[PDB]
Amino acid sequence: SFVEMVDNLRGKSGQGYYVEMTVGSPPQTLNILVDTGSSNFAVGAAPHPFLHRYYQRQLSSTYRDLRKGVYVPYTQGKWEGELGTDLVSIPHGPNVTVRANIAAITESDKFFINGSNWEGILGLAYAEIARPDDSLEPFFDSLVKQTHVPNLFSLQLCGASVGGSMIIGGIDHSLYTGSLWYTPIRREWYYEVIIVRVEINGQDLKMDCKEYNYDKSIVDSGTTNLRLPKKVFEAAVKSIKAASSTEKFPDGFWLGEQLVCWQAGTTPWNIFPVISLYLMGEVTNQSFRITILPQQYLRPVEDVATSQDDCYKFAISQSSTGTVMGAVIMEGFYVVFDRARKRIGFAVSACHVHDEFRTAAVEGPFVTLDMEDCGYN
Numbered sequence: 001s002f003v004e005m006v007d008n009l010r011g012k013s014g015q016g017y018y019v020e021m022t023v024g025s026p027p028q029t030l031n032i033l034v035d036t037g038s039s040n041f042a043v044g045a046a047p048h049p050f051l052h053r054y055y056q057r058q059l060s061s062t063y064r065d066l067r068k069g070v071y072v073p074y075t076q077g078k079w080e081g082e083l084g085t086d087l088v089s090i091p092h093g094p095n096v097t098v099r100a101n102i103a104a105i106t107e108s109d110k111f112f113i114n115g116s117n118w119e120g121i122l123g124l125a126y127a128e129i130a131r132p133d134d135s136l137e138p139f140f141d142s143l144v145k146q147t148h149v150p151n152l153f154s155l156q157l158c159g160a161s162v163g164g165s166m167i168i169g170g171i172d173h174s175l176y177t178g179s180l181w182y183t184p185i186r187r188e189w190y191y192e193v194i195i196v197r198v199e200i201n202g203q204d205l206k207m208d209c210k211e212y213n214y215d216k217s218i219v220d221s222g223t224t225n226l227r228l229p230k231k232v233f234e235a236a237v238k239s240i241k242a243a244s245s246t247e248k249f250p251d252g253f254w255l256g257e258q259l260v261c262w263q264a265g266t267t268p269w270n271i272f273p274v275i276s277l278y279l280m281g282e283v284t285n286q287s288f289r290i291t292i293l294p295q296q297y298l299r300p301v302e303d304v305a306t307s308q309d310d311c312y313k314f315a316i317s318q319s320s321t322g323t324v325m326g327a328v329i330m331e332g333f334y335v336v337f338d339r340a341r342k343r344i345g346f347a348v349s350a351c352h353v354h355d356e357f358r359t360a361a362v363e364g365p366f367v368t369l370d371m372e373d374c375g376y377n
């Protein structure tokens, strides 16, 4: 019964993917951003200039107040609110209703996005990073505990405004081609993984592989960009600049601020390199790689001036809290969050990018010694 969940995600480019949900009795419909980078389920519950609707606890006969406050500060944005529980369902999801923790957002700062069409956030990661502490059971843990839904979900994030699928409870084999390749979940807090090698256009960055995971590497559907630790970011940009030096870009472009444009259909994809991320595999001394096309890390944005050109933003950013494999990395892959087996699977998505001479790929096996040394402690 996974066909009912195909295409259950929507969104606007750079503004997050959301799934429709209902909370309360009678059911109140809300669009909820899907976030593997956090673990709180929270919805707007008070007016806000960017909210078209919000959760009204007063209108829900099943609402239960927990008489405890909560706040969550993210890398970008923060909110505070009141904890409580209520009945929750996913119309284009499993045919079940669960009682789950809900943070009723009463104040927020740079959290909600104007015109994004979502009013809440579904943190899919583990209790260890839940606020106020790990005793606030995350939504997916409640779903698994209260129903027969298997302990896994998969995300098919599709590019161009955007759509995708969140298959709750399994793997939909029509959404990918080739084989699934699995990397261990290093520790169950974020969806933490270990990157063991990085190549740009086939050239090894030749850094201490610990630099790639300093101080961690996570899979984060709630972040648009690929985010890299300072030292890795500088090396990647230096290499990407050199590969595309035949064209001029303002240095604000390389900071993700100012956009670059080209005459419609003349974007010089060939001068931007492919990025290969090698991930720790399932067997001794074995890894595999996912290859990222420039169509993934050059995000198309709306044209500020006359909508004649093709304009893009550089979707790779510097991080001070480790590597973040954001939505643009996940797009074009089918990503399986196999919580039951403590692993994350990658396969080429059915909604893959269509470059002329290059193709995004998930390839293995590769031999890589001392992979454990790549993890930071």
Ligand SMILES: CCN1CCCCC[C@@H](C)C[C@@H]([C@H](O)CNCc2cccc(C(C)C)c2)NC(=O)c2cccc(c2)C1=O
Binding pocket: 014, 015, 016, 017, 033, 035, 036, 037, 038, 039, 072, 073, 074, 075, 076, 077, 111, 121, 129, 220, 222, 223, 224, 225
């Ligand atoms: C998709 C557009 N947007 C903004 C999305 C706004 C709404 C979701 C957005 C608060 C979740 C977190 C996501 O959870 C972060 N994951 C790691 C993390 C970092 C610090 C603290 C925590 C704990 C709460 C667990 C977790 N994302 C960000 O911060 C973020 C930053 C920069 C750009 C963007 C998002 C973006 O591209």
